[PDB]
Design an enzyme around this catalytic site. Structure first.
Site, PDB file in Angstrom:
ATOM      1  N   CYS A 114       0.801  -1.214   0.000  1.00  0.00           N
ATOM      2  CA  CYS A 114       0.000   0.000   0.000  1.00  0.00           C
ATOM      3  C   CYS A 114       0.840   1.274   0.000  1.00  0.00           C
ATOM      4  O   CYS A 114       1.449   1.624   1.010  1.00  0.00           O
ATOM      5  CB  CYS A 114      -0.922  -0.002   1.219  1.00  0.00           C
ATOM      6  SG  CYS A 114      -1.817   1.534   1.420  1.00  0.00           S
ATOM      7  N   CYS A 146      -0.275   4.080   2.405  1.00  0.00           N
ATOM      8  CA  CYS A 146      -0.001   3.633   3.771  1.00  0.00           C
ATOM      9  C   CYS A 146       1.436   3.993   4.146  1.00  0.00           C
ATOM     10  O   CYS A 146       1.706   4.440   5.263  1.00  0.00           O
ATOM     11  CB  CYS A 146      -0.173   2.121   3.909  1.00  0.00           C
ATOM     12  SG  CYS A 146      -1.797   1.499   3.416  1.00  0.00           S
TER      13      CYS A 146
END
Length: 112
Positions: free
Chosen positions: A36, A39
């Site tokens: 991600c 993230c």
């Protein structure tokens, strides 16, 4: 170091939620994944916030791929996802990598 606690299993997950309940402190969880991108971008902030609120809020990190059982039960679909837990149950959440919203969420629960 006392900042972010990395959850590595369901057993650890249950022990930490119980901790928040026993100490009467809110828990903020960061559901993330190595693949991600957003993230990776918000993680530095999550860590800083953990230093800024040490002693008031407990910060946990869950790598969804490493701990599928928790990810599934938590009902995760988009990354990153942040949950707040109080007295053992989900009390609030935030989905997305909004830095301004993450700050507001933590501050809100750090209070009452």
């Amino acid at each position: 170091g006392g900042s972010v606690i990395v959850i590595d299993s369901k057993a650890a997950w249950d022990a930490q939620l119980a901790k928040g309940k026993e100490e009467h402190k809110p828990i903020v969880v960061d559901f993330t994944a190595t693949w991600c991108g957003p993230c990776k971008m918000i993680a530095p902030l999550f860590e800083t916030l953990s230093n800024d609120y040490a002693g008031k809020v407990i910060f946990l990190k869950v790598d969804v791929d490493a701990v599928a059982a928790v990810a599934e039960a938590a009902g995760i679909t988009a990354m990153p996802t942040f949950h707040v837990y109080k007295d053992g149950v989900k009390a609030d959440d935030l989905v997305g990598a909004s830095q301004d919203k993450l700050k507001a969420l933590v501050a809100k629960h750090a209070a009452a």
